[PDB]
Amino acid sequence: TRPANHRQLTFEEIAKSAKITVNKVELLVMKALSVGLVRGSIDEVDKRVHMTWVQPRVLDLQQIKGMKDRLELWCTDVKSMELLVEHQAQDILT
Amino acid sequence: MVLESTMVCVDNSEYMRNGDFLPTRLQAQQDAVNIVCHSKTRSNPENNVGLITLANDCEVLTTLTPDTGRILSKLHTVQPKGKITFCTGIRVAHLALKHRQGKNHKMRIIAFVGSPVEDNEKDLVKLAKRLKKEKVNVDIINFGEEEVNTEKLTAFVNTLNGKDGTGSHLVTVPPGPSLADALISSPILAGEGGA
Amino acid sequence: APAVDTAEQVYISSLALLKMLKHGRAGVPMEVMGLMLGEFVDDYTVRVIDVFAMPQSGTGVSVEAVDPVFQAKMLDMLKQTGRPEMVVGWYHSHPGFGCWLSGVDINTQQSFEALSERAVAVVVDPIQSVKGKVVIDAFRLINANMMVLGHEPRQTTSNLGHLNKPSIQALIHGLNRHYYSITINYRKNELEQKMLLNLHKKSWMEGLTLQDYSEHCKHNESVVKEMLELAKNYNKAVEEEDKMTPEQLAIKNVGKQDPKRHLEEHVDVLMTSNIVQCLAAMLDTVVFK
Amino acid sequence: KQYEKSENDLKALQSVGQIVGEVLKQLTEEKFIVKATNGPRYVVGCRRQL
Amino acid sequence: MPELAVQKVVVHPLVLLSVVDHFNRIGKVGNQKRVVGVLLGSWQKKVLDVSNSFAVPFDEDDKDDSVWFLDHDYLENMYGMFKKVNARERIVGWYHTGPKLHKNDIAINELMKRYCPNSVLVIIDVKPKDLGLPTEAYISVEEVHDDGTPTSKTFEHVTSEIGAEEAEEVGVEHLLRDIKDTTVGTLSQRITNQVHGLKGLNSKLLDIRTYLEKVASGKLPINHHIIYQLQDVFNLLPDASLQEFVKAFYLKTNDQ
Amino acid sequence: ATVIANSFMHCGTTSDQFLRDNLEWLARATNWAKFTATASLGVIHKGHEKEALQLMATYLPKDTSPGSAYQEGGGLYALGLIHANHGGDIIDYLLNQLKNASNDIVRHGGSLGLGLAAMGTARQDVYDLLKTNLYQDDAVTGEAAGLALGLVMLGSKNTQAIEDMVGYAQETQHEKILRGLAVGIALVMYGRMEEADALIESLCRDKDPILRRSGMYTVAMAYCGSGNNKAIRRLLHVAVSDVNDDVRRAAVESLGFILFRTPEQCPSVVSLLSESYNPHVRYGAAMALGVCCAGTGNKEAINLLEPMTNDPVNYVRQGALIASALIMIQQTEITCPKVNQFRQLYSKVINDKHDDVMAKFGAILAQGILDAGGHNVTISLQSRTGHTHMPSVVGVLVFTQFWFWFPLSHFLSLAYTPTCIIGLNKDLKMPKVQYKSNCK
Amino acid sequence: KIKENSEKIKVNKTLPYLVSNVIELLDVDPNDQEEDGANIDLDSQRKGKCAVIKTSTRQTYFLPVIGLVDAEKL
Amino acid sequence: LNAKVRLLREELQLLQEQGSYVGEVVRAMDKKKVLVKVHPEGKFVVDVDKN
Amino acid sequence: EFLHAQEEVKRIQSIPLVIGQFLEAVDQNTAIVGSTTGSNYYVRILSTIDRELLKPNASVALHKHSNALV
Amino acid sequence: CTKIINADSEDPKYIINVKQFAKFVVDLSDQVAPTDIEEGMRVGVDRN
């Protein structure tokens, strides 16, 4: 749901969604990592599971739409930025 | 026939399953085509023969060449259960007539009907009119329509005659047992030469 | 009353030149040949659209190898493709000497001259070409008949004029017995230049692609170590440089060529990689996020 | 069959025939100084296809 | 019939030059229609080297793309002949000349395999589809796609590279003095390349966006490869920081 | 090269001598070299109006004397060259022949001769005829006609000529015809400055190389007589970037033309080009210097010319040799040592056979232009009306072209005006009266 | 295709050409461990079987033998 | 920079010219040629150079 | 153009090459060497690369196509 | 010719050895016969 700013979620936040205890959630997440369904790291000092990698999600319409949000945003940041790269020493490209 | 190039259209259908022509209508139609193709070359070596299909997505399988063997090889192999899209077969045959190794020949298509035609009568009437202008003549051999009921072909033929390199005509063979090959008797080997 | 029958300056397109360079290069040390197909328009321009090789020779560019049969066979096919073109001339490679025809080759050349007067003979040297316009000349056959007519000056007229160079023995001998030399100039369109350039997708992408941070630090430290060496020579050079010419001063008060230059090149390469990667890194992080 | 057997000469001539050696000294993996069987010594390359 | 030996392909500049030239010339066919000719290169090897191309008789009609002209025999004749000019030029397959990849192309792909050893379908366009090469390489694939849709026959793309042999390199290098992607000669040369990668990236973003909508409305087949590829960019997480470099130069400039 | 040189050298006098000795020369001759010789007679016998029709008479088409195509066409050119710079009667004669035959190599001469006689009428009749000659797509009559047309419409900026010649240039990919239309287009564009800019951009813009190569001529005439900054910038910019050899060479020749009025600015600009080892750029550089300095000779221009002369590549030598002669134009041995040395230098190229064929061509032409008028004619930098002299520019622009067809250099005769005290009174008579002269 | 091959070998077969003697054969495998150009073949850019000859200059060549008459036939 | 470009380009053509050996002029002959004794190869009589 | 030109020389610096021994320098331009091919050569030393650490005694390579000391 | 044995699919070839220490084969530009080329017989042959 979250953009490419954070793929980090806390244990607390995972527990709320799951509606399963914080303790058992920590073991469950570890078994999923172990199998290889998901990848990432667990920092239990912070208590976040930082997802490096996430798998192909469920095919519903909404899920097609989630992809659009990032692609559209990316179109505008690239335009802005492309102009800054052209700007620097425009006198010499030759 | 003299200074002429002809492409033969083979009708792959689902009404070629009948043994009214032996062995199978289609196999009898291969044979009918092959003797006509040979007759044309033998009579006048100035003849070229090419092969096009209605079957599948429509493409020119082999082109016009003095060699009857080039066309024959492909004819047997083309899918017996093909499409009876007539109009698309005619159009591609027009494109091949343009591209030959020596260009001085008239443009002709001789067409086989293994079956009653699927696509509207309206469409064929039109195609015939535009095609007539480019000066490609389609001569239609009729056994195929007749199996269920009287020939639609005669109307398309009539529209076609008026401007052609050589005349168009309906050659009729009974759809039952008299064999496909009987077409050698009716003239398609040499048209009417008409205007 | 007189006719034309001059050798016009041959316009070689970008694809045809590449096909000649490739034909020769595989083809040598063996003497090889093939035909040139094009269109000739006007009385100044012959454009060489395409070439292909009509079966390659053995020992010599033999008179056996020139074949009207193969030439005829290939020509009728072209008609069916809807590209009918005519034989504009023919090309051959010699590795023997740059811009030279063999003895056998002049006889072979005569069959092409009879077919069309505008038949040309191109000598390709793959051994001695490392610019690929170099050591290629267009030539024309000198028979007993041609020399008596005075066809040889007649060729220079209608273009910029061109004489060969490679080797002394090959230029004197070639000029008398073998040929007269005439010009090749090149026209290649802007589309041809665009395809020539090889636009490539990863080629531009690398510019953005971020290199390791540790690798820049490591490099920064390595680069400094080259400057240190140069720095001893550089301290001595700088003490007196009170006259003119920095290079003389620098050599004189120890330090081969320019110690300053060496130092500067060393920072520039490191600065270049670090500077672009920093520009790229800040940009990507913000864009993707 | 007849085609492939004659054609083998056709390709070999374009590959160009081979002058043979034995490897004299391994200095680096890009250049090797190689010694001809005939005699005169040469520098050869190694390609990454072997 | 089908087989894979395509893998990755490298293209000499000669292929690119040959297809446009023959394409217009072939009978003044419009430069947005489907035209196919034989594609030459070395073959029955794992890495594919596309050397050259040559035309095969083709006419493309307006009324449908299910009506076209092609001479199959011509493919066979050409194969033998190309061997004399170079040993590296044999029947590799066929070339398509844009603009997209059509259903109508699939009928010819089938056919080509018999004629050629197994063929490749390379699409060489007259204008890039991105900003780099105008070539795409394809192999026919059958894959199950689910959203209410059955198993689809499609063409799955494999990435392309550039590359040439020594003869080709010699002429292009002497002739070139153009601006290029980058030549390299200054720091400033390098920025031109940086501008070109970023502009390229903009182009790809537009194609995917318009398609995402089409998938949602139509229930177009969902290819696993696309959904997975886009997903990955998002998950990796950007992080970037500390950067520095030297400043030795001043004493040197001052020194001059 | 000898025919051009002599055409210029023996000008301003009648010469029955020339026809009588150089009959064997005419017989010996082949190709374009033969055409130049029959054509050249007009320049040698320039003026001498009574005799004009009579001397040429055999060469000129007859029912009682039909020669070679080469002779018939050169005959027609010869009347046009004598009466050059307009003459009402001369046109009518050329016009009947042009429209009737509509042939090849004979027609080519007719168009050139006809162009001169018509020069500065803007006639529609002439437009119709020359159009017919172009339209066939016959190679020789096409280049001649395209150029011929531009002479007639010149300096009024007639719209129609520009339209006809441009539309044709684009459809047709014939390079020979192409060069002749472009030049035609330039002759019309003269002295309109900034206006010309719309057409000039269109010609550089195209993916075609041929338009671009001939494109430089338009810029050259129009911006001459007050040169624009944008216009010089383009000429330099196209040259560096190109891989197309002819296009490159050409760009460099025009630089001298726009600066013709301020000759001072050109040797610096050319210096950068002189230094490179590119022979195509070297060729153009020589020409640039040659035209700018042509009225007002600079020492600096001469020095740049020296390495191009002895260079390996064939064409650069030619350029240098023709160019020096043109700057220094008809100064005596008492004005400078340089003219005397240069006359000998050309001879030298001829004595030795170590040198290119092409250097030899330039050497004999060079001697002749310098020596032109019989040591009486000069080319102007500008008129002293503070804009450029029209005969000087039209002639020089065309002169560059001699390879496509060699009789096109004869057109040079238009630049040549002698410098004297001029002081006619009312009745079409110069007087015999003496003039005060306060010079050595 | 056959007539074209057949004429080219013949141009090769006509003199000049060296004569030597075959001391030994080896006949090593086709396609050693490489891929380059053309196709896998007895000889090409890929060559298997060869025969070593000692020529009359006291020079040695190991060369691939044409398949018209093989190295195994040699 | 022009000069540097030129040096390499000239260097490339000048050099391509095959061969270049050493000999010794043992003697000179009345044919205004000199006998060269090439040290591990055949002896060759050549014309004088202009150098 | 300088970057394009350097490319061209690199190719020559590389194989084909034939080895010799480099005896001594008679000019910075050109030097005398001896081959294993049975020919003593006067070969040119490639410019815009050092010819001044060329000069001591060492093994050296000469190009086969150009007959120079690259 | 050191020895006569060759006549391999052309009018008699034999091994003739030039004094550059290389062996070559002969063809007709006059004739060739068992008697024209012999065990000791020297021959005149072309360079190319």
Coordinates of C-alpha atoms in Angstrom, one line a residue, chain C residues 1-6 9 11 41-45 47 131 133 149-150 153-154 156-163 165 180 183 185-194 196, chain F residues 30-34 68-70 137 139-140 173-177 179 206-210 212-213 243-249 312-315 318 356-358 403-404 406:
Chain C
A1 CA 29.8 13.1 -82.8
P2 CA 32.1 11.8 -79.8
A3 CA 30.4 10.0 -77.0
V4 CA 30.9 10.1 -73.3
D5 CA 32.2 6.8 -71.9
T6 CA 34.0 8.4 -69.0
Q9 CA 33.2 9.5 -59.6
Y11 CA 29.2 7.3 -54.9
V41 CA 21.6 8.3 -63.4
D42 CA 22.8 11.4 -65.0
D43 CA 26.3 11.3 -66.5
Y44 CA 28.0 12.2 -63.2
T45 CA 26.6 10.0 -60.5
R47 CA 25.2 5.1 -56.8
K131 CA 40.3 3.9 -41.6
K133 CA 38.3 4.6 -46.7
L149 CA 41.8 6.3 -78.2
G150 CA 43.0 8.2 -75.3
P153 CA 42.7 11.5 -69.7
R154 CA 39.1 11.3 -70.5
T156 CA 40.0 12.4 -65.0
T157 CA 37.6 14.8 -66.6
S158 CA 34.1 15.0 -65.0
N159 CA 35.4 14.7 -61.4
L160 CA 37.8 15.7 -58.7
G161 CA 40.6 13.3 -60.0
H162 CA 42.3 10.7 -58.0
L163 CA 45.7 8.7 -58.3
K165 CA 49.7 5.8 -53.5
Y180 CA 44.0 4.3 -64.9
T183 CA 37.8 8.9 -57.9
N185 CA 33.6 10.1 -53.0
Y186 CA 31.0 9.1 -50.3
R187 CA 27.3 10.1 -49.7
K188 CA 25.6 8.7 -46.7
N189 CA 22.2 10.1 -45.5
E190 CA 21.3 11.2 -42.0
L191 CA 19.2 8.1 -41.5
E192 CA 22.3 6.1 -42.5
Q193 CA 24.3 8.1 -39.9
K194 CA 21.7 7.4 -37.2
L196 CA 25.8 4.0 -38.2
Chain F
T30 CA 37.1 14.6 -76.8
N31 CA 34.4 14.9 -74.2
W32 CA 33.5 18.2 -72.4
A33 CA 37.0 19.7 -73.3
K34 CA 35.8 19.9 -77.0
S68 CA 29.1 18.0 -84.0
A69 CA 26.7 18.6 -81.1
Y70 CA 29.6 20.0 -79.3
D137 CA 15.6 15.0 -66.7
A139 CA 21.5 15.4 -67.2
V140 CA 23.3 18.2 -69.1
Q173 CA 17.5 13.4 -56.5
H174 CA 19.7 14.2 -59.6
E175 CA 22.8 16.0 -58.1
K176 CA 23.9 17.5 -61.5
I177 CA 20.6 19.2 -62.1
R179 CA 23.6 22.2 -58.3
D206 CA 16.7 18.3 -45.0
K207 CA 17.9 14.7 -44.5
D208 CA 19.1 15.0 -48.2
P209 CA 22.9 15.7 -48.5
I210 CA 22.6 17.1 -52.1
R212 CA 22.7 20.9 -48.3
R213 CA 25.9 20.9 -50.6
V243 CA 30.4 12.9 -42.4
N244 CA 29.2 13.8 -46.0
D245 CA 32.3 14.7 -47.9
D246 CA 30.9 17.0 -50.6
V247 CA 28.7 18.7 -48.1
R248 CA 31.8 19.5 -46.0
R249 CA 33.8 21.0 -48.7
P312 CA 49.3 15.0 -51.6
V313 CA 45.5 15.0 -52.3
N314 CA 44.7 16.0 -55.8
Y315 CA 41.9 18.7 -55.6
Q318 CA 44.1 23.0 -58.0
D356 CA 48.7 15.5 -59.9
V357 CA 46.7 15.7 -63.1
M358 CA 44.3 18.1 -61.2
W403 CA 33.8 19.8 -62.8
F404 CA 30.1 18.9 -63.6
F406 CA 33.6 22.9 -67.7

